Amino acid sequence: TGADLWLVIRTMQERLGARPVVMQLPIGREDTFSGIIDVLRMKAYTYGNDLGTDIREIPIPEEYLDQAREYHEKLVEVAADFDENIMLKYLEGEEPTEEELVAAIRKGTIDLKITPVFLGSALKNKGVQLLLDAVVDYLPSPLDIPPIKGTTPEGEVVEIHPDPNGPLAALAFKIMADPYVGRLTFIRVYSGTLTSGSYVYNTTKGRKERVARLLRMHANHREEVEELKAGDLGAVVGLKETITGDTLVGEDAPRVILESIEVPEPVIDVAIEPKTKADQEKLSQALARLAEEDPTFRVSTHPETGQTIISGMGELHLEIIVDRLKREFKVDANVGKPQVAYRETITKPVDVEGKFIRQTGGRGQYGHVKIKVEPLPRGSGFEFVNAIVGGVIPKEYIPAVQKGIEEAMQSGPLIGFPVVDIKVTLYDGSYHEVDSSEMAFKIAGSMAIKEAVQKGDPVILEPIMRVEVTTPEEYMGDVIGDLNARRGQILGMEPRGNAQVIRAFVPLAEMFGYATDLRSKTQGRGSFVMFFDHYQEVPKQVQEKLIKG
Amino acid sequence: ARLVGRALELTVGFSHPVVVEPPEGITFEVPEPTRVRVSGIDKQKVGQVAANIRAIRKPSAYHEKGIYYAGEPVRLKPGKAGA
Amino acid sequence: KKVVAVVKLQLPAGKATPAPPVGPALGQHGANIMEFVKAFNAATANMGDAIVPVEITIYADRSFTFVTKTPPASYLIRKAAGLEKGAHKPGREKVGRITWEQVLEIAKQKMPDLNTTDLEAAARMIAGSARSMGVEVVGA
Amino acid sequence: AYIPGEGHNLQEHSVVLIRGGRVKDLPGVRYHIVRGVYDAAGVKDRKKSRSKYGTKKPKEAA
Amino acid sequence: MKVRASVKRICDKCKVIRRHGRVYVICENPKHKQRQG
RNA sequence: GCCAGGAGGUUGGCUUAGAAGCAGCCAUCCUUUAAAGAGUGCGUAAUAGCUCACUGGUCGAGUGGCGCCGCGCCGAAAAUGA
């Protein structure tokens, strides 16, 4: 129930903009099915049963006929946006020769113009042979597929011909496992003949390759072939290096390369922390055969926190990845939430006394540093001034007293992380010929900085990303809702074409795995891009709640 | 909504056909399957059976789908609002 | 085919885009709003800008027609009484001052718009709308 | 495991090709890296030690 | 709301209807569905 | 109760990514009118719309609001059987 025509049709030019000319019409809506009519060749192939053991093709049962007839007319009428014969023929009211249909229609079909809607039902084997015939009639041969793009062994354009005498030049795709013929590469050549038992050579990372046996997955059993032709398709054994998307020419064959540069860009970011880091490198071997059988994902550690991160382009994707892990790799890794790099700063001018009045066994290393410290905008940078009130602190502390300002600014006072985006300054000090080393005033700077940042108005500058919601208006309003509900704030709404994209502030702590969320609120109308901006405060209470140990 | 002989065999969201039977004092009558008609000769026991079928398969279920007198459906967010 | 759909909007002078809901109203039109953009900007060459009302239409065989109108009185007061963005809040701060002639042109310009297509009401009318935007007045 | 010098990436895998040779640096410097391997492939633009420092054959195509 | 000793007419579209003995506060939205209990 | 007008400066100004009677601060109009407010509530991403307000058509007799006092009602659950 729900099996229809106008449904699908409407949906086509209402969800993309196609041109759904169809060529077959049903005999009985839901349960009441018995076969199809064909406004193409003007015939009514009808299947008198589900299994399809005894089918037929009698004319219209009485009520249809005229119905499909107008659509037949439509067919020829639409064919007026192509040649010259058909158009003028409908003008004449002349009958289309049964094969100019095959013409003008396969014309538009392969020309990406018309939408040869053939249809049917699977379980009740109906509406089948009509579309197999429709394959053998309207589905494009490699003769009609235009010059395939690519690069040279030098650097320009390419012309990959269907030529079964042309230079061996191929592509390959899938990396199959196998017991007997092991590593199996599923390939579609392009231009160039290849022998069973000869050689080849990878035209990517360069590797002379032995071709063992060309093969064709013939439905049930697999069929071993003598050769692969220029344009034909098949899978080969050997190629003990060939990965995926590799361009493969022969041993010679002007070492040409294929264009095809696709992208499995990151959209998911889930963390993973195995129990003890012994299981970890072990699972780096797990990944060693995970990242080497399935490209896609990116296994990138974070810098400002340990724990390798699993990034990728799919929710359930990453998840059944994790399943395969807890299946044939058995790892104990309490799948963690992604951590955050937290910088920090202040908002006040504090004057302090970095006085190191300490005369050890004579050498001291005493350093009285009088600094003024000033704070400025989050995004500015690090400042300091060559500020001597008159001529106090030696010119050998100048690039090394401020070190202890920098040095003691990798470890913040709170939970302790790099305190950034601040000015600083200085102003005075005290100096003594022997009783003072470079590092003495470096550490005077350490003391100075610690007191002047502990007592200086603490804060935490957690990072915040910009994000481009790529989606239409409906779910746009919806997601603007969500994003407000994600602690941050938006700030961008430029009306695009088939979409309307929203530039959005969202707080990196929040916005965790937002695709999973997004991929729902819009059902599926695209997504966004990770466009990181800058950092700002966590609204008071989130700062102290995080004060742990 | 079908009507065979005396009984009405409507088929709603339920996994089985709904089988009602016009009792003493009133008559139903199903013109087309998309809308049942009820000639009720008893204003009291009438709306009781209207409500019988309405409450047999209640409509509006968040988005839509069900049995409406004609009372304009109040919506609520469909594939959403369940975190 | 699409028969008669007159849809009018509020496109200011400078935006050369069919941005929604200009699409789902003038798409069922086949709108030469691009022609509205390059024949109305020059029509008001005296400033070539300001927010101006419009009216576009379709006649079966895809036939367009734009109909333009006049600038608004809060912009047509900002240019006059020397306001920048405004006199921040109508109950506190004031910039310029409206006398017995600036008001005259405020009504003159916008004669065929306000409400009453009559002069002897319009002046005082927007002179009150003046206080709604936050501009003081010299009274004589 | 060390490295053959300037021009790095290496992150966390690389298949750093355990090689051999200590110095007065890092209490170890034993079993060096190679650049080329599964990763690194030498200095972005190197004109000499291309026998480990990656870069193929500086064809400036001119 | 929904069942509490302090029943209000909240959004004016609600009524107090002393049905079946005790007080309810009915409207359109069943979210306002108080009760004197 | 029912039919219907339910307006124009306008998107008040201030804000603000936008705040359009309608998230928030000040405000604290004036006009076409019989009557329509710088707005009561829903709704929107903000507009849109729905909407009250207000006023006539119908109508034909009583209504809308606030306080007080008497008795109640909810408030009001525990252990063997009342």
From Swiss-Prot, chain A:
Its main location: cytoplasm. GO terms for biological process: ribosome disassembly. One of its GO terms (cellular component) is cytoplasm. GO terms for molecular function: GTP binding; GTPase activity; translation elongation factor activity. Keywords: Cytoplasm, Elongation factor, GTP-binding, Nucleotide-binding, Protein biosynthesis. Coiled coil: none annotated. It is found in: Cytoplasm. Catalyzes the GTP-dependent ribosomal translocation step during translation elongation. During this step, the ribosome changes from the pre-translocational (PRE) to the post-translocational (POST) state as the newly formed A-site-bound peptidyl-tRNA and P-site-bound deacylated tRNA move to the P and E sites, respectively. Catalyzes the coordinated movement of the two tRNA molecules, the mRNA and conformational changes in the ribosome. Belongs to the TRAFAC class translation factor GTPase superfamily. Classic translation factor GTPase family. EF-G/EF-2 subfamily. This is Elongation factor G. It comes from Thermus thermophilus (strain ATCC BAA-163 / DSM 7039 / HB27). The gene is fusA.
From Swiss-Prot, chain B:
Transmembrane segments: none annotated. It comes from the Bacteria. Part of the 50S ribosomal subunit. Belongs to the universal ribosomal protein uL6 family. This protein binds to the 23S rRNA, and is important in its secondary structure. It is located near the subunit interface in the base of the L7/L12 stalk, and near the tRNA binding site of the peptidyltransferase center. This is Large ribosomal subunit protein uL6. The lineage of its organism: Bacteria, Thermotogati, Deinococcota, Deinococci, Thermales. The gene is rplF. The chain holds residues 96 to 178 of 180 of the full protein.
From Swiss-Prot, chain C:
One of its GO terms (biological process) is translation. One or more lysine residues are methylated. Keywords: Methylation, Ribonucleoprotein, Ribosomal protein, RNA-binding, rRNA-binding. GO terms for cellular component: cytosolic large ribosomal subunit. The keyword Nucleotide-binding does not apply. The keyword RNA-binding applies. Pfam families: Ribosomal_L11, Ribosomal_L11_N. SMART domains: RL11 (SM00649). One of its GO terms (molecular function) is large ribosomal subunit rRNA binding. Belongs to the universal ribosomal protein uL11 family. PANTHER family: 60S RIBOSOMAL PROTEIN L12, LARGE RIBOSOMAL SUBUNIT PROTEIN UL11M. HAMAP family: Ribosomal_uL11. Forms part of the ribosomal stalk which helps the ribosome interact with GTP-bound translation factors. NCBIfam families: L11_bact. Part of the ribosomal stalk of the 50S ribosomal subunit. Interacts with L10 and the large rRNA to form the base of the stalk. L10 forms an elongated spine to which L12 dimers bind in a sequential fashion forming a multimeric L10(L12)X complex. This is Large ribosomal subunit protein uL11. It comes from Thermus thermophilus (strain ATCC BAA-163 / DSM 7039 / HB27). The gene is rplK.
Swiss-Prot record, chain E:
Keywords: Ribonucleoprotein, Ribosomal protein. The keyword Ribosomal protein applies. One of its GO terms (biological process) is translation. It holds the Pfam family Ribosomal_L36. It comes from the Bacteria. One of its GO terms (cellular component) is cytoplasm. Coiled coil: none annotated. One of its GO terms (molecular function) is structural constituent of ribosome. Belongs to the bacterial ribosomal protein bL36 family. This is Large ribosomal subunit protein bL36. The gene is rpmJ.
